[PDB]
Design an enzyme around this catalytic site. Sequence first.
Site, PDB file in Angstrom:
ATOM      1  N   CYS A 198      -0.781  -0.230  -2.610  1.00 57.08           N
ATOM      2  CA  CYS A 198      -0.806   1.207  -1.754  1.00 57.08           C
ATOM      3  C   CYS A 198      -1.281   1.170  -0.439  1.00 57.08           C
ATOM      4  O   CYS A 198      -0.538   0.594   0.322  1.00 57.08           O
ATOM      5  CB  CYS A 198      -1.798   2.123  -2.554  1.00 57.08           C
ATOM      6  SG  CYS A 198      -1.861   3.634  -2.003  1.00 57.08           S
ATOM      7  N   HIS A 203       2.208   1.883   0.297  1.00 53.15           N
ATOM      8  CA  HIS A 203       2.624   3.463   0.088  1.00 53.15           C
ATOM      9  C   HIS A 203       3.185   3.689   1.460  1.00 53.15           C
ATOM     10  O   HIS A 203       2.763   3.210   2.403  1.00 53.15           O
ATOM     11  CB  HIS A 203       1.084   4.093   0.211  1.00 53.15           C
ATOM     12  CG  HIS A 203       1.321   5.556  -0.086  1.00 53.15           C
ATOM     13  ND1 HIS A 203       1.125   6.298  -1.345  1.00 53.15           N
ATOM     14  CD2 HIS A 203       1.598   6.694   0.487  1.00 53.15           C
ATOM     15  CE1 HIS A 203       1.492   7.394  -1.058  1.00 53.15           C
ATOM     16  NE2 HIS A 203       1.776   7.771   0.283  1.00 53.15           N
TER      17      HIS A 203
END
Lengths: 187, 187
Positions: free
Chosen positions: A105, A125
């Site tokens: 992420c 992400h």
Amino acid sequence: ASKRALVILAKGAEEMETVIPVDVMRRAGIKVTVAGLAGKDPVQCSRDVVICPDASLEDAKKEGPYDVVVLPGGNLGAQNLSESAAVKEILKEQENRKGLIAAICAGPTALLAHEIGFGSKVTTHPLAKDKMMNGGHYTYSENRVEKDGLILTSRGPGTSFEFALAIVEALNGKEVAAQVKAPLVLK
Amino acid sequence: ASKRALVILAKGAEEMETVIPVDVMRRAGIKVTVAGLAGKDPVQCSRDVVICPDASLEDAKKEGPYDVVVLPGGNLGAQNLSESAAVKEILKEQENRKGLIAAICAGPTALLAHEIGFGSKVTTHPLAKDKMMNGGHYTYSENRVEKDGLILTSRGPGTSFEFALAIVEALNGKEVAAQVKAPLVLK
Ligand SMILES: [Cu+]
């Protein structure tokens, strides 16, 4: 001998991205150490879930080496990881010994901070892409999980199971990963 | 006024099934109380993740009513929920007031224990089906998430996002659920 994982837990970590990998690696029979970046005290995650780490990072690092070092995401957690000299040292040693590093992420942005794995194909992400790509030190991927050798990255809370099972496959093999996956009721 | 969720956290709870709903409901702007069944002390989950609850159940129950009561799974956690007089009372009051009850994995077996929602269509983890179905008080479903009115059930760690977003949709609507879903990097 069971394989060993170090999960580095900092204030602001994304709690799903921390707990899913811990739980899944433990299902796989991996010995997981949840290490608090700041010490042994409870850690307040991004969505206010409070997790008690198994040990301080100071202590856990003396108990190496680990087969994988895992960096959860969360924007603030990753910033704390990125600022940490102790994390720098751990990751450099892991890279030097040809051990797996797994980050999800915003987590991979700590690789950039610590100059780890340059030249690797990575994902993050979507909102962390521009930070990861500053300087063009990595090649970007939109795959849900990206594994380029010993650098394993993934995108978000919703890719956490896939990320964790990729760590299981890397450490314990395809058959163990399949066995662990089935009871989870994925897909 | 924001909606309010009570998550009842017992020893042996499945930590992914606890943290995913807490995190996702908080993303949706729901005020979530993580309540420790046994008191305010840290809770050792099924895979040894230690979570600090926001309050004891004894205290949280005085701070009702809640728009949803959430029961995580985990075989041992659900057994603890099933044995608890305090949980019985909470669920009966929630049913009486026409409020949502959400349970995942082995969690729905606590509904059976407390005689809640008989006649509902339900799902559970596959390994919990025979326990849930003892006496034929429910109709069984293999859907990943099952919602029969005010009884919302789901199957396992891998259905936790779907379960949580169904709670968000029930409380805050389809548009909020879609907005919360997108940044998660699901599917
Ligand atoms: Cu704690």
